[PDB]
């Protein structure tokens, strides 16, 4: 038969804030840096 039908790997670290995945612990951390850092998404205040 056919199972998985995929050839990439495993991505346990799946960010929720936006919905990103990774294959390492750090990869996720560094990624989260963006969300935390209020630069792109933010209220209307200058
Ligand atoms: Zn994310």
Give me the CATH number covering residue 32.
3.30.160.60
| Centroid of ligand 1 to alpha carbon of 18 (angstroms) | 4
Structure tokens at 45: 């205040």
Rounded to an integer, what distance in angstroms lies between the CA atom of residue 7 and that of residue 31? 24
| Centroid of ligand 1 to alpha carbon of 34 (angstroms) | 8
**In-domain check, residue 35:** yes
Tokens 């996720």, residue located: 28
Structure tokens at 20: 């990103």
Rounded to an integer, what distance in angstroms lies between the CA atom of residue 23 and that of residue 11? 5
**In-domain check, residue 4:** no
| Centroid of ligand 1 to alpha carbon of 9 (angstroms) | 19
Rounded to an integer, what distance in angstroms lies between the CA atom of residue 6 and that of residue 2? 10
| Centroid of ligand 1 to alpha carbon of 36 (angstroms) | 10
With residues binned 3-state (H G I as helix, E B as strand, rest as coil), the percentages for the chain, rounded to 5, are 25, 10, 65
C-alpha distances out from residue 2 to 5, 6, 8, 10, 22, Å = 6, 10, 16, 18, 25
In angstroms and rounded to an integer, the radius of gyration of the C-alpha atoms of the chain is 16
| Centroid of ligand 1 to alpha carbon of 42 (angstroms) | 16
Rounded to an integer, what distance in angstroms lies between the CA atom of residue 35 and that of residue 39? 8
Query: What 3-state DSSP class applies to 27?
Result: helix
Structure tokens at 33: 């840096």
Q: Total structural domains in the chain?
A: 1
């Amino acid at each position: 038969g056919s199972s998985g039908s995929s050839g990439s790997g495993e991505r346990p670290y799946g960010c929720n804030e936006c919905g990103k995945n990774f294959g390492r612990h750090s990869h996720l951390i560094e990624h989260l840096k963006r969300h935390f850092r209020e630069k792109s998404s933010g209220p209307s205040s200058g």
